[model samples]
Target: MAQASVVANQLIPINTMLTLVMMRSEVVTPVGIPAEDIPRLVSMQVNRAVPLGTTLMPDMVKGYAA
Candidate 1:
């Protein structure tokens, strides 16, 4: 859901994170995250150096506050 590549693991909180994501209706094959999952992911941190257009899974990020 990131807007750009993360050079290192980024600790993204809710307010700033709002710009990083888009609720796109389409996605690539394999484990595409649903829109419903977004709300609870506040304060989540990236676990890897993610590229642009990557879809997030629960395991890829630190535990969400919700």
Candidate 2:
């Protein structure tokens, strides 16, 4: 599934957002995926977004993954 971070109350008063994410596989570059495969690739990765909204700053955090 995709993970994502969004502003909790963006439409309301507390509208603010910043997110950090990691995919099952890393893209070689920000624009790594080829244009031809955009649709399929995006569909595959759409569910992998990490929910990061609650993990925003002000509360410092850091860790490692195996």
Candidate 3:
């Protein structure tokens, strides 16, 4: 699963540009089994921003886990 740390909360306007951060887990799944095949684990670099309490779905972000 992917993990992230949120520092605080505030209002972000619609269409307003911004930045954010997120971290991913090291446990990787290959096919149907679990394996840490990748030698390196990297944090998710969010070069984009999501809607601030605007909707349950966003164009840049999607998935039941997210």
Candidate 4:
């Protein structure tokens, strides 16, 4: 599944419910953020605005890398 934020080019603030979805097919090579890691992902801040359908890669989220 490909994990992508529900919002479009929005700032993913820390400690907020990230608007995300699992794509039917892989959005990128890493195949998106694992469902189990979603909880911890909240601790991170993208800092930059992420576009809609942007695959959440491990490196994108600090301290939540696979």
Instruction: Specify the highest-TM-score model's number.
Output: 1
TM-score of each: 0.49, 0.19, 0.23, 0.47
- The C-alpha stretches of model 3 lying farther than 4 A from their native spots are 5-8, 19-66
Q: TM-score of model 1 relative to the true fold? A: 0.49
What lDDT score is found at residue 7 in candidate 2? 22
lDDT of 2 by residue, 1-66 (tens): 233322211221132222222122222232322323222322122212224222222122122111
Encode model 1's per-residue lDDT on 1-66: one tens digit a residue.
433221212333333342234323334445544545564554456565444455555456655432
Model 2 regions lying over 4 Å from their true place:
1-31, 46-66
Please tell me which model should have the higher lDDT, number 3 or number 4.
Answer: 4
lDDT of 4 at 30: 44
lDDT of 3 by residue, 11-61 (tens): 433444333322212322222111121112122222244333322122322
The predicted structure with the larger lDDT, 2 or 4, is 4
TM-score of 2: 0.19
**Could you give the C-alpha RMSD of every candidate to the true structure, in order shown?**
7.8, 13.5, 10.8, 5.5
The CA lDDT of each predicted structure is 0.43, 0.24, 0.26, 0.48
The best-first sequence of candidates by TM-score reads 1, 4, 3, 2
> Runs in model 4 with CA error above 4 Å?
1-30
Model 3 Cα RMSD, 1 decimal:
10.8
